Amino acid sequence: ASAYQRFEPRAYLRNNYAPPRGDLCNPNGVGPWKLRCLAQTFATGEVSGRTLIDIGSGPTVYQLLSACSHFEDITMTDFLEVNRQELGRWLQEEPGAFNWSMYSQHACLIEGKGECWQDKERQLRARVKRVLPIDVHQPQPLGAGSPAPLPADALVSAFCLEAVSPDLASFQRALDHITTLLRPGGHLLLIGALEESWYLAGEARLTVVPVSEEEVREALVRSGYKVRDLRTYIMPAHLQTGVDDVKGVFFAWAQKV
Amino acid sequence: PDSAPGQAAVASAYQRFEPRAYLRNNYAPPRGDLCNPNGVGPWKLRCLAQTFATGEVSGRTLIDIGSGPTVYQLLSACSHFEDITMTDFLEVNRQELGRWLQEEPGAFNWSMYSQHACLIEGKGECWQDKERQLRARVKRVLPIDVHQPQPLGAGSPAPLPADALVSAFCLEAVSPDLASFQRALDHITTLLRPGGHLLLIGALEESWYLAGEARLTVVPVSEEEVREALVRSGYKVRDLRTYIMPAHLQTGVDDVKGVFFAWAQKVG
Ligand SMILES: Nc1ncnc2c1ncn2[C@@H]1O[C@H](CSCC[C@H](N)C(=O)O)[C@@H](O)[C@H]1O
Ligand SMILES: Nc1ncnc2c1ncn2[C@@H]1O[C@H](CSCC[C@H](N)C(=O)O)[C@@H](O)[C@H]1O
Ligand SMILES: Nc1nc2ccc(F)cc2[nH]1
Ligand SMILES: Nc1nc2ccc(F)cc2[nH]1
Structure with a gap:
């Protein structure tokens, strides 16, 4: 946990969202695969409502690109002030913001509604109402009077729980915690690293709990979810870069029941 | 009568043609705004994409007639032709294309066009790949004069x-009158094999446009005049459609009233 106090947003972004992993041209890559799960899921029309919360957003926005057109009130979160600052830089189009435009473009490409990427980013920026601090270790992660x-x-969370959880059991609790934030019948879209034990973010070196696809499913069932969909992306050699030891990426679509 | 005087006026006027001002006037916003699907930019790209998407227009070699300093008109084309010739009257335009081919930063940025083409082609192609293909498939950039009976010169x-041939906003913009337009059409048609296709885009009812200092003269033509010329040159007209310029795209860089797109096949 206190390791997160060294966490460098720019080094994280660079490590995971710039080439090679951030090169979206090849459809067999992890970025396109993620955007596709997101896009395909929302395209079904079954995940809808007025409000949505992104859990442990970090400094990234790609996880909301296909989401923003289905929810007029979007709340983004993160534990670190430095990440919330970095999101704001993109939200307010301030100087030095990270360039997500390749991801926007690809989301537009994938969605296939002939939308221009500027419109997509415009809608996201408009629908994100707030960027709030959060701790999934708290039984009320957002706090009292949020x-x-x-x-x-509905909820979204990518690369968070498994990354703030020393082991399987804490992972399970953290899931139960955020689950309280979700209205019954609601939807959860959860993305994460498979069989990963560590990743770097500049001077920070974060520990991760190695989880498998079945472990992820069981955890979801335990928390009271019906698993609508659960898919796995195996990490090709050329995307194994020495910034971590992730073996695969999972995508889960779960419904609180 | 005499063609030489009019043609000389034309050549003269184009010596003041500034590529940068022309690009700004026509391919930067508002006209270069590709977000509005009702805009002229997306209408053009849509015509070209839909046409190549029939699969009916293909082969080895393609010639873009009067390319100027633009490439958007080849974005959908380049996936269907291994060998592409670009062309223009002005050396300054040919250099402008030079900058883009070398992927120089000084060059004009067509990435919004590349993206929008990828977007409507519906293959999930990324724009960097499309641009890299076009650059690979452009085999030469040649001087051209559509008033010559051999527009490209002899032994070119x-x-x-x-x-196939592509040409956008060339003929009506270098032809002093309908008869000159018709002749220019006849000359470029000699470059097309029989059974080949011409994709033609141009201004409707326009008499002038601006390219910096240069305020150039244009022969205003109508859909029906365009159709008759194509028939006259020995084409079957496969498609001919018209875009009417919205008031807020009428910005005083020209007096264009609409844009036409013609798909024609040379009778053979
Ligand atoms: N106790 C906690 N509660 C919630 N989030 C936490 C947390 N501790 C760390 N985090 C955040 O978890 C994030 C993991 S990295 C994930 C970033 C982004 N969601 C992506 O898909 O790339 C970090 O930004 C980190 O600050
Ligand atoms: N006699 C001639 N023969 C062929 N092209 C000519 C010509 N005289 C001028 N041109 C070219 O006609 C062009 C018209 S502007 C069209 C540029 C481009 N095709 C586009 O779509 O925007 C100029 O580039 C100009 O140099
Ligand atoms: N946190 C995190 N983001 C990622 C993006 C791509 C990838 F392959 C692994 C990743 N881990
Ligand atoms: N030469 C030229 N290019 C154009 C692009 C759009 C338009 F509306 C008019 C144009 N004239």
Whole structure:
């Protein structure tokens, strides 16, 4: 946990969202695969509502590109101030913002509605109402009097739980915690690293709990979810770069029941 | 009568043609805004994409007639032709194309066009790949004069006859009158093989446009005049459609009233 106090957003972004992993041209890559799961899921029309919360957003926005057109009130979160600052730089189009435009473009490409990427980013920026601090280790992760409309109609979280959880059991609790934020019948879209034990973010070296696809499913069932979909991306050799030891990436579509 | 005087006026006027001002006037916003699907930019790209998407227009070689300093008109084309010849009257335009081919930063940025083409072609292609293909497939950039009976000169590089021709906003913009327009059409048609296709885009009812200092003269033509010329030159007209310029795209860089797109096949 206290390791997260060294966490460098720019080094994280660079490590995971710039070439090679950030090169979206090849459709067999992890970036396109992620955007596709996201896009395909929302395209079904079954994941809808007014409000949505992104859990442990970090400094990234790609996880909301296909989401923003289905929810008028979007709340983004993160534990670190430095990440919330970095999101704001993109939200307010301030100087030095990270360039997500390749991801926007690809989301537009994938969605196939002939939308221009500027419109997509415009809609996202407009629908994100707030960037709030959060701790999934807390039974009320957002806190007491959070500005966030609760309960949310849906949740999104990518690369968070397994990355803030020393082991399987804490992972499970953290899931139960955020689950309280979700209205019954609501939807959760969860993405994460498979069988990963560490990753770097500049001077920070974060520990990760290695989880498998079945472990992820069981955890979801335990937390009271019906698993609508659960898919795995195996990490090709050329995307194994020495910034971590992730073996695969999972995508889960779960419904609170 | 005499063609030489009019043609000389034209050549003269174009010596003031500034590529940069022209690009700004026509391919930067508002006209270069590709977000509005009702805009002229997306209408053009859509016509070209839909046409190549029939699979009916293909082969080895393609010639773009009067390319100027633009490439958007080849974005959908380049996936169907291994060998592409670009062309223009002005050396300054040919250099402008030079900058883009070398992928120089000084060059004009067509990435919004490349992206929008990838977007409507619906193959999930990324724009960097499309641009890299176009650059690979452009085999030469040649001087051209559509008023000459051999527009490319004699014993020219271009593989002739070409399997298809593209031309956008050239003829009506270098032809002083309908008869000159018709002749220019006849000359370029000699470059197309029989059974080949011409894709033609141009201004409707326009008499002038601006390219910096240069305020140039244009023969205003109508859909029906365009159709008759194509028939006259020995084409079957496969498609001919018209875009009417919205008031807010009428910005005083020209007096264009609409844009036409013609798909025509040379009778053979
Ligand atoms: N106790 C905690 N509660 C919630 N988030 C935490 C947390 N501790 C660390 N985090 C955040 O978890 C994030 C993991 S990295 C994930 C970033 C982004 N979601 C992506 O898909 O790339 C970090 O930004 C980190 O600050
Ligand atoms: N006699 C001639 N023969 C062929 N092209 C000529 C010509 N005289 C001028 N041109 C070219 O006609 C062009 C018209 S502007 C069209 C540029 C481009 N095709 C586009 O779509 O924007 C100029 O580039 C100009 O140099
Ligand atoms: N956190 C995190 N983001 C990623 C993006 C791509 C990838 F292959 C692994 C990743 N881990
Ligand atoms: N030469 C030229 N290019 C154009 C692009 C759009 C338009 F509306 C008019 C144009 N004229």
